[PDB]
Structure 1
């Protein structure tokens, strides 16, 4: 039978869902609670349709807030004051961390299926805007950073970059924010276009539509925050965009199957210099790409090394400037023992001689002490000081889950977080590292 196109979701629909619980004039003018906001972690309690705000040093759950169902990610405004979360269903909640009791100050629905949201990060534009992307309808929406008022909706339906054929369903994938220009960086999956959207004028809207590679998914900025490196996953490529000049710089095959970097991991390789790393969903490989055209021209935008980690099914790779370690999970691996563990490479020991660097295997799920099921360990996230790294031990909604905190210096267990309210923990986002894009 002929398929019936699902309903659209425009301004009228968004505005009807738009609710401002606490108007800006009624919010505080300074932090009114005594929490260490920058060291706070926003944790997704997936199936419960909630998030937990957890103290990064005491591990105390400061509060559990109701949100949209299965929040995909948490993102922070550039000032670190406002917390934005978006559920699979397209529901966005804006939380004021300055309130005596932080809660949702405004909410809005931006589509039927959505996975991304981000805040304005250009100097001078702090707290000005938020942007959300949807799978359905194929669109992104720029909202007021203070009230969530929907200001500009842009359809992503359009032509594929290569064969230049119309595609009626180009889903918006990752959305990042430029630190070089007042622009949002939007990945459009099926058409293989990366959009640089200038938010200085939403009426006379300037955008740069960059032809990249199809199946764009996730990615991150390099250490200098100038270049966006993203995975065109189904095609095993990493695309590099210069956000300063607003143009494609390179497209390179990682040599692995289905790279899935998350925002990736930037570090200074002892021999190669500045690099960005990604693991893969399709195999056990970890690939490094040079990210320094000025200082290391010969290595810039070239895959410098590829080596195995725990196994396939990896989703997130992580490191921090203060750490000498590179953490790699294997969340989707069919083998319980593997999906419940993390590989850790010693960056200092890397020579880049072509051999496979050794890694230590952390039995994260074992450390959490969970009997039932075969819980999957996922996504490392560092605290503000970059001295501890957290991992979610993801089990079923009616099963026991946990968060495992690892001491980065020793690679030993630091703390196991368990609470009856900790249902299906997945994404974890430290306020400071998220607001500053430190990865």
Structure 2
């Protein structure tokens, strides 16, 4: 299998608009923090959609099948990475936002993130690849590749050499000027300090194998991530740079996305995950100072719509916990979302009731069996969007739900809305509000 190093990255690196030629203030009249960046998967595009008016402001060409959008800490720069390893950086301040720089970082990739420590706004971006097993730290204004690190190495437990440790989720610390890198097959979480790329400080945390996705707790101090194939949640303290806990969720194949933080009426601050392998939702306590007896313990587990869930969501202004069932084989389940009333949760051991929102039905799609995927809130936390993902030559939609009432707010359809998948609100992504 071919390697992909600095020479290869630099050959693919193009700066379309140099920093000095970009605006010094916002030159369009858009409401950038309420904008949604929506993947148009099979079109190799993204749509920038007004969070209040639902107007598609622009459709931009990107790498094929963008996996996620991430925002710089200032909210000015939009970063997307295709599954092919192509990264595009877009300047939202331009009169007509477009790609200002691009680069290829490997042959297979899923993650990108921006520096989020106070004082390091817009300084760096980082991308992780499945192939070659590596991550790369890039300049936050130009995408210049600055530091490439191989993730080949020893497994944490058996301590045997692994020739293919894929980089899974990448998050950014709010406590130290560090990136948080999950290395799947070796079961290591890397805390990479970007204050000095020549004298590179890292903390390689032995965790659990099969690390995938995860998120920070409400305080933004603790990183909670799924070692999915081992059904565990690994907790690392980003302030102290150390593993704090590893706990089994009781479910099969936890798949949080970035997860859902909320204040449980009985348990206090918790983070929740749903599962791909069963219908369960698990809650872990996230407050060692205030609720020490509940911290890092699995406090409750209860059913949602069905197996094949990918994303769980809430917002500080919402009383609701939304859970999709995207990969369920049954169209009636994959086309709907479960919604729990957080205010009604007692943690008495019973199974909280949920309301079933018929999201695909609300979108009115005649053909196929579209899959509903990934709740994402607007900046005010008053509306939540879901993608109604159908095939490239079929009819898809976005469905906007009024969070206060749980009623349909708006259906977004456009001929350009091809295979809509991930949706990222600028404000909630730049601030890690989830």
1:123 Cα deviation after fit? 0.1
How far does the alpha carbon of each residue in 1:236-280 deviate from its partner, in whole angstroms, 9 at most, with x for none? 000000000000000000000000000000000000000000000
> Matches of 1:97 and 1:13 in 2, distance apart?
28
1:421 Cα deviation after fit? 0.1
Q: Which runs of 4+ in 1 moved over 4 A?
A: none
How far does the alpha carbon of each residue in 1:262-304 deviate from its partner, in whole angstroms, 9 at most, with x for none? 0000000000000000000000000000000000000000000
1:141 Cα deviation after fit? 0.2
How far does the alpha carbon of each residue in 1:16-56 deviate from its partner, in whole angstroms, 9 at most, with x for none? 00000000000000000000000000000000000000000
Task: Give the TM-score normalised by the residue count of structure 1.
Answer: 0.99
> Matches of 1:410 and 1:157 in 2, distance apart?
50
Give the corresponding residue for 1:292.
287
SS of corresponding position for 2:126: strand
> Matches of 1:99 and 1:428 in 2, distance apart?
21
SS of corresponding position for 1:28: coil
Task: Give the TM-score normalised by the residue count of structure 2.
Answer: 1.00
- Of residues 395, 399, 411, the one that matches 2:394 is 399
1:390 Cα deviation after fit? 0.1
> Matches of 1:415 and 1:160 in 2, distance apart?
48
The count of aligned residue pairs is: 434
Give the corresponding residue for 1:233.
228
1:165 Cα deviation after fit? 0.3
1:129 Cα deviation after fit? 0.1
1:419 Cα deviation after fit? 0.1
How far does the alpha carbon of each residue in 1:178-221 deviate from its partner, in whole angstroms, 9 at most, with x for none? 00000000000000000000000000000000000000000000
> Matches of 1:9 and 1:46 in 2, distance apart?
24
> Matches of 1:366 and 1:205 in 2, distance apart?
52
> Matches of 1:260 and 1:195 in 2, distance apart?
20
Equivalent residues in 2 for 1:184-333 (5 A)?
Answer: 184-333=179-328
1:370 Cα deviation after fit? 0.2
How far does the alpha carbon of each residue in 1:356-392 deviate from its partner, in whole angstroms, 9 at most, with x for none? 0000000000000001000000000000000000000
> Matches of 1:217 and 1:120 in 2, distance apart?
20
1:15 Cα deviation after fit? 0.1
> Matches of 1:405 and 1:8 in 2, distance apart?
43
SS of corresponding position for 1:404: strand
1:93 Cα deviation after fit? 0.1
2:41 is aligned with 1:10: no
> Matches of 2:30 and 2:149 in 1, distance apart?
38
> Matches of 1:147 and 1:334 in 2, distance apart?
43
> Matches of 1:289 and 1:116 in 2, distance apart?
25
> Matches of 2:184 and 2:259 in 1, distance apart?
18
1:136 Cα deviation after fit? 0.1
1:69 Cα deviation after fit? 0.1
> Matches of 2:219 and 2:394 in 1, distance apart?
42
How far does the alpha carbon of each residue in 1:134-154 deviate from its partner, in whole angstroms, 9 at most, with x for none? 000000000000000000000
